[PDB]
Amino acid sequence: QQYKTFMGARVLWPPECADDILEGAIRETQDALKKFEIAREGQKIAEHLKKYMDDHFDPYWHVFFGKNFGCQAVHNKNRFIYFYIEKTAFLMYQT
Amino acid sequence: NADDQLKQLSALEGANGYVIFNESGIPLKRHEKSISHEKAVHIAALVSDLWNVSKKVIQRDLKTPENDIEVIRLRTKHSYEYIITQSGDFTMLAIQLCGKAIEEAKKAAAAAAAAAVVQEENKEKEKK
Amino acid sequence: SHLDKVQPVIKNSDMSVEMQKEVEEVAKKAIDYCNTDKEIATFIKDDFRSRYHGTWHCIVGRNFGSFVTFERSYYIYLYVGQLAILLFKTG
Amino acid sequence: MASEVMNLSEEDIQFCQKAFSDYDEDGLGAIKVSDLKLALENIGCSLSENDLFKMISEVDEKNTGLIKFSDFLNIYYKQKYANLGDDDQDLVDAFVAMGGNADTTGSVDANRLIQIVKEEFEMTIDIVGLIREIDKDGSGEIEYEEFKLL
Amino acid sequence: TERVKTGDRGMSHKEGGWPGNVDPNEAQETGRFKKRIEKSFPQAVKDLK
Amino acid sequence: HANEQIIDMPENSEMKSMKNDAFSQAKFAVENYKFENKISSHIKKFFDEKYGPNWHCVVGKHFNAYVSYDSKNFIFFYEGQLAILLYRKG
Amino acid sequence: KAVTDMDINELRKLMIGKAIINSSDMQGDLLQEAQDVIQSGIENNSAPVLNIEAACKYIKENLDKKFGPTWQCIIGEGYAYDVTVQNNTLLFMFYNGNLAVLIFKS
Structure with a gap:
């Protein structure tokens, strides 16, 4: 439950996801937001992130990002990444 | 000394009650005929909003430099009159009535006195 | 000298002291700027919304009773004259 | 730094008009209240909800800085x-x-x-x-x- | 995602504006305060009246 | 009031109950638990016993998500104000 | 007689159960449930002297259980307020006499 800030993004201090992959995913999400805002056409940015994960990581990645939501899921070892950027929290688990 | 002014205000013909407001809005003294404190709390809030808005409006809305309202008099239906005068940091509201209104009030007072006399007579009869 | 005269007093405060001091200046500025009480409520909500992002509900009246569900430490209660400046941010 | 862009002038000018109107103060910064000042003076929209709607849709907002000017730049485009x-x-x-x-x-x-x-x-x-x-x-x-x- | 805390508090503004130190409900606090104001006060009331 | 929902479940293939169970479970679970995190765990557990494992469900009042799910195993519906999304992957 | 005989003091004394609705923004079926609960609750908690805090506490608790977790309602003699609420979540009705009631869902 102890949130930590890394590379300008707030995420769980103990990282469920791999340190290498988690940093890449956070950088990609920040770049995507810089281009497309969450508030307008928010569905498009989430879809782009999911396709990007398949290109550089194992396939069938699940990506869910919302301002307020609660979820519990089963994921592969070191395949779960949860982080908060500004007021938006992005959670992705690889299946 | 201060008490005498309230008695003097009542003495003036056509005067119903007097209410005094502090800069904060607390009512210093109010007339006994009119509701005390509950009416004063309700009257002080309305006059401050009106006096402050009018004072602010004259200086900016009318575009007149160094012009300040001295007395505001609101004439409504029946005999109601509500002259407002501000001295130092204290502003008060005075409620006075017209001649007809005063006559009506006197008649009402006379009727009340008559009713009281009738009640006394009834009590005497009961005692007898 | 009118600003000295109003002497706004906060009966109940649930906010940081530095933030609370800023609210007093905005409250005094809003009353002189707004011709009517209805305008004062709109001005306070707009200034706070610009200063802090979120949903702000502000109600000011001579006599009223209020029970609200606001974010903790985002509710400041101050009374000036017969006007109550009450702002409570709800998520 | 322009790069060969005609674009409309009627609107581009309007923004500058209303902008300097309230920004006349020459503070160099813009708040969330000033943006509404204009529409509040002329009475463009009924409630701040309108201006706040489009503006908010733009991306985000804060207390006061200067980027608020976007309100006008986009305001002209919401006239339709x-x-x-x-x-x-x-x-x-x-x-x-x-x-x-x-x-x-x-x-x-x-x-x-x-x-x-x-x-x-x-x-x-x-x-x-x-x-x-x-x-x-x-x-x-x-x-x-x-x-x-x- | 963390849910912002929601606290429910009910208050009454029916009582007129008063200084924080003084208590509106208590008669003693209001009575002492009114006496202090008229301590100045005497000249204004005759003049105002 | 759940004006628009996405339904992708088999009809008259004897798996018709999965759609019915999701609507019934969401209404009962959401009212009693009254927690976003708890609703996802309860809905996932009931579905897991009845139709096997590898079921992921996320419940949020407002959220945007993109995911890959097995065909005819994904149903999206709104239970009152709350929105619940449940699907089976793997 | 009739309206001419009636006075503001007389009208308030004559009827205390009269219900007046000034602003409606919530669905009518929802309003009927809310109106019955608020009128019954205020009279029960009115006591010897009406308490603004007492009426709001009872209304706030009943509304939270009845519809949603975060429900805010404010009642005052006179007030000016700007409130942002969800569609069909705000109902405004003032009781006979100097009693203004505002209930909204956030």
Whole structure:
């Protein structure tokens, strides 16, 4: 439950996801937001992130990002990444 | 000394009650005929909003430099009159009535006195 | 000298002291700027919304009773004259 | 740093007008209240909800800085289009003016004549055309029509 | 995602504006305060009246 | 009031109950638990016993998500104000 | 007699059960449930002297259980307020006399 800030993004201090992959995913999400805002056409940015994960990581990645939501899921070892950027929290688990 | 002014205000013909407001809005003294404190709390809030808005409006809305309202008099239906005068940091509201209104009030007072006399007579009869 | 005269007093405060001091200046500025009480409520909500992002509900009246569900430490209660400046941010 | 971009001037100028209007203070910064000041002065929108809607949709917001100017830059683009309809006479004229105008004649009179049970079936129609023709050119223009009808 | 805390508090503003130190409900607090104001006050009331 | 929902479940293939169970479970679970995190765990557990494992469900009042799911195993519906999304992957 | 005989003091004394609705923005079926609950609750908690805090506490608790977790309602003699609420979540009704009631869902 102890949130930590890394590379300008707030995420769980103990990282469920791999340190290498988690940093890449956070950088990609920040770049995507810089281009497309969450508030307008928010569905498009989430879809782009999911396709990007398949290109550089194992396939069938699940990506869910919302301002307020609660979820519990089963994921592969070191395949779960949860982080908060500004007021938006992005959670992705690889299946 | 201060008490005498309230008695003097009542003495003036056509005067119903007097209410005094502090800069904060607390009512210093109010007339006994009119509701005390509950009416004063309700009257002080309305006059401050009106006096402050009018004072602010004259200086900016009318575009007149160094012009300040001295007395505001609101004439409504029946005999109601509500002259407002501000001295130092204290502003008060005075409620006075017209001649007809005063006559009506006197008649009402006379009727009340008559009713009281009738009640006394009834009590005497009961005692007898 | 009118600003000295109003002497706004906060009966109940649930906010940081530095933030609370800023609210007093905005409250005094809003009353002189707004011709009517209805305008004062709109001005306070707009200034706070610009200063802090979120949903702000502000109600000011001579006599009223209020029970609200606001974010903790985002509710400041101050009374000036017969006007109550009450702002409570709800998520 | 422009790069060959004509763009509209009517709107581009409007923004600057309303902008400097409230920004006249020359503070160099812009708040969330100033943005509404303009619309509040002229009364563009009914409530701040309107301006706040579009603005908020832009991306985000804060207390005060300067980027707030975007409110005006985008405000001009939310004006969109107007359209309304006024009067019922003009339509009547156009019903007879098939060339989609006041001009030409007798053909519209014959159109009225098709299935016409009106009195003075054709002599009355010719008399009406003459009455509606003040300048003697054998036609009734819109101004003559209006005078005739009123 | 963390849910912002929601606290429910009910208050009454029916009582007129008063200084924080003084208590509106208590008669003693209001009575002492009014006496202090008229301590100045005497000249204004005759003049105002 | 759940005006628009996405339904992708088999009809008259004897798996018709999965759609019915999701609507019934969401209404009962959401009212009693009254927690976003708890609703996802309860809905996932009931579905897991009845139709096997590898089921992921996320419940949020407002959220945007993109995911890959097995065909005819994904149903999206709104239970009152709350929105619940449940699907089976793997 | 009739309206001429009636006075503001007389009208308030004559009827205390009269219900007046000034602003409606919530669905009518929802309003009927809310109106019955607020009128019954205020009278029960009115006591010897009406308490603004007492009426709001009872209304706030009943509304939270009845519809949603975060429900805010404010009642005052006179007030000016700007409130942002969800569609069909705000109902405004003032009771006979100097009693203004505002209930909204956030």
